[PDB]
Amino acid sequence: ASSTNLKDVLAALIPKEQARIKTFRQQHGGTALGQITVDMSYGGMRGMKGLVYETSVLDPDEGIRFRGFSIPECQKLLPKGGGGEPLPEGLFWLLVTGQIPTGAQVSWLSKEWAKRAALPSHVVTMLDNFPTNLHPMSQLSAAITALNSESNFARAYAEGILRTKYWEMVYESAMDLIAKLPCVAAKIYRNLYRAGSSIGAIDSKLDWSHNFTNMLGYTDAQFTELMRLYLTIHSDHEGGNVSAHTSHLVGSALSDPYLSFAAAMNGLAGPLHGLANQEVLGWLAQLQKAAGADASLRDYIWNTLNSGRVVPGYGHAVLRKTDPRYTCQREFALKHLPGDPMFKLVAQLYKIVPNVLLEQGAAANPWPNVDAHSGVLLQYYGMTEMNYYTVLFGVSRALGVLAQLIWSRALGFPLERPKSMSTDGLIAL
Template sequence: MLRSIRSYSTHVDLKTTLQNAIPAKRELYQYVKKNLANKEIGQLTAGGTIGGMRGYKSLLWEASVVDPNEGIRFHGYTIQECQKFLPKAKDEINDPKSEFLPESMFWFLLTGNKPSQDQINEFSNELALKAGLPDYLNKILDSLPSSLHPMTQLSIAISALNNDSKFAKAYASGIPKNDYWEYTFEDSINLIAKLPAIVGKIYSNTYHNGEKLGELNLNKDWSYNLSSLLGLTSNDSLNLNKLNQDQSKDVVNLVRLYCALHGDHEGGNVSAHTTHLVGSALSDPFLSYSAGVQGLAGPLHGLAAQEVVRFIVEMNSNLQNDISNSTKIEEYLWGLLNSKRVIPGYGHGVLRKPDPRFEAMLQFGLKRSNEFANDELFHLVKNLSEIAPGVLKKHGKTKNPYPNVDSSSGVLFYHYGIKELLFFTVIFGASRSIGPLSQLIWDRVLGLPIERPKSVDLKTLAQ
């Protein structure tokens, strides 16, 4: 049974819902600050300090926690629970294959309250109304060489929107600290709203000579517009990959699921932590999240999905399409491990059990058995998830031998026609905005200070 969730009137908008939640959170923050400042919540070690601070509980993050054994929880709720109570697209409410919306997840992460269907319908419309790009940004993106990495283009575009930052302008004019959050909120909503158009523009310029691939639809949700602007909907001549109506509907739901699940993963990951760190200097949301995107572009963070697809394609070729032969699969994996290579898509910095996000993405394909019946890459991913953990356990050098979300997500996009592997991370960049920006608003609500830990040298650690 789902735990009770606070819910306000269906006529209350997101900002008012947030305002209603602020007093209690500020009171709790002040209580902790005044009464529990000396409470110990962990132990620092030399190994932790030189090992990337892994496991240090030193960052306030409100919306999600990654439990080593249970995986991600959003305000205490599992993925499966969120799938049950978070609203879907208004025209797919009763469709069992329809996924909940990223904007539903943003509302929930930001406020801790379950949004109503009416509230999300209105919020989706607000995002669509604010989705258009200013002329100066279109000119900037059109001026960039198509050879420039798409993640670099994404970071440039987000930074450039600083030109319109309400927070930056208000701060320059001199506003009370208690009002910082309102301008941060407005900037964050504007940024999230414009990401589908930014992503679509980058995809068009980089891979399709600037050809118009889709249209913004003011009556559709955020993920639908993102899919449309990538040419993935069945809109007559704009249908880039010639998807039929059912496939188009499925790929929109894939984008919804992917973006909702990738939106937040507690605060310690590079993109989230970087956004928080830069924001702690009172940089506006555009500059803060642009920095987070640059962290996401690193091969140890956001580029994992593309590496998995490369690996699966190569493995399928080496197996000569004999994807159900467990003996051949095991031999192939041992060959990798014995040559000091890793199995892409396996292992996790925190998790010690299978990643529930992987299971949710895998189930997306399994629910569409007819669509994926002849997709050898998808079925190889499934078979690999049943065989690789045993091999890695025998190998004995991996703390978590189970598949993470990257094992499945890239192959699903590949199936529907996004075969430009570098671009997977750009879609990730759109989705990851949801969590760090919701936390950035809370950073300003609570008046968190600039982040400035003390450093230490090796000589001191060695004493």
Template sequence: MSTLKEVLRQKIEEHRPRTVRLLKEYGDVSLGEVTIAQAIGGARGIKCLVTDISYLDPYEGIRFRGKTIPETFEALPKVPGSDYPYVEGFWYMLLTGEVPTMEQTLEVVEDWKKRSTLPQYVKDVINALPEDSHPMVMFSSGILAMQRESVFAANYKAGKFNKMTCWEDMFEDANNLMAKLAPLGAYIYNKKYRNNEQIDPDPNLDMGGNFAHMIGQCDEYKDVARMYFILHSDHESGNVSAHTTHLVASALSDCYYAYSAGINGLAGPLHGLANEEVLRWTQNFMEKLGGEVPTKEQLEQALWDTLNSGQVIPGYGHAVLRKTDPRYTSQREYCLKTEGLKDYPLFKLVSMIFEVAPKVLQEHGKAKNPWPNVDAQSGVIQWYYGVTQYDFYTVLFG
């Protein structure tokens, strides 16, 4: 048994009595009232989920297992020669709540390599789809196609379901799926945007590094992938995609059904497509300004013109946050320390909007949160490295 699975087993056994006691002694405690507006408005603000993985503080931003984003990046074992952690080590932390050692991290790295081969039938499914299919359709279809390999579903069908041990089947399915997501995403990217020129994985690389390698990217982009996958991993489990996976899995659907459903929710314009829309707006905004980085005075007037015309400033505001999204800050810091990127005109415009927009939005008075969210930055980094296919950005999120 792997170290991760054994540690998780201990955590689950320790946690169960707490849950039993909570239900027995406090099961009738009310968590608050629900208004008609909340019911009609998609359950916004209703306390109806239990999660230990992350917590979204309005003023600190996301905490993963109690750690802020800077604390998370600092604590996790780093890929040699990189400032960024292994995604596999982050997976260990999300599941257990413990920061893994380098040895424990590398055990997950090696385990995922063994599980990462993308079956030929998955490629056949993707190849059978119309050429103009959205990459998220391909991504969701590829995930769903692998359901035939579900350990959870097979054992349930065989009459081996046990509610005390079924987490082990879900654990196997989840690791099998996570290990194949990067190869699946890379296969789709190469098929749609690189004339189907597929690149075999490098057995010496981690998940993030291998994704960059398999889509023909430079070494710098390996850190972009590691950073991006961690920053977009979870956001209190209550957003559309995360909530959908919980809901579908509650019917004892296996993780292939559940994750595919979550990916479908992620594809919506009000969720995962937001980063694409922000980048389009920023590029169009720059074009209206003559294609040059404006002065702060010119930018301020342009932002006022945008608001006065009834439009919004995409990438600014958040349903919960009341400060700059730390996921935005992490990406901004990456840009500022990366030669070439820090002087990239599109980034300079995004950076100037960050300096000017909050003041304008505060004076405008209608935005509850005048600060940037994660989407205000992420598309610019992708564009700089040549990942200029808007449609693919949500696959990166997934």
């Protein structure tokens, strides 16, 4: 047939990457990066360099970057569904490499996951008897913890593999995870909202995104495409966010990938971490019954900002133009769902909001994010089961919390371990 080695590649790159970091820490190593304040301790390590996360960096001028590769350059580059919208595969490839997977490097992986894609009967069991009253983000988290039984790394932990051999199996757990994530999550849904029917089979002929949607039991061809672009973009976004930080912290403790990703979700399961996409959509909804004007919404938002309220969705700390990940989904409705009452709307906010904000001193990056653009698309296709949107966002962040997990292991990074505080101490300190 055809293919590239992935693991094979990975294996080659490393000593390259492990040498650059050793020269580096070897010279400039103890060079003075920053200061800690008694305020930043109390602020959640707020603006406190402490990462070394390597897959993505926020650029105040371009948005997020999957190397130097920004939202837009991936789009036209990462290899297409064979559609318009990119494959989370090539994306996951990119992230692990620093490279743009070619045709057969991407398909390489689809066949790869196709395969890897097997769920124990004990996780099937357990998913099945979960009471509906248990949130999806809760059942997910439990499955993955239960799937941890299957971990090649735990097992080679037991058996005594060696340091340097750490990645070559945190990788193996790594691919399987991603492979059987859409089964766990397809299963959740179906069980929840599709009157617990079957999730179906797995077609090796299909690429990740599609078997998800087809396990998800949606058939709209446009549907899958959104699947493909939604998994790519929600993917990664620095190593300081709840989800990533948490895969990282638990993972540091040499905890198999599975274990660090079901904690990573207890983290995403958070309110100040999991529900944004949702918040907005609800506010829009309210907008919804509260076709109309530039004039009336400019008036309502006006009132909103003035009545001490805020618009769920716009205004980023650093960002310094449109989160392109918003643009990405907007570049889509038009393609797609162009005269959609609720999209329309969304798109109005776009016209109105930035100005009002700027004009009503609550600026310097008044442009919307992603969380403003998705929910309106999910629902359009049928995806109205909102509690569930958090799983989709966990099925996507997957690709970028694993694809570095394998590198923290690979570079051989130590136990996260920040000496802790105490208010009586600092008072003397």
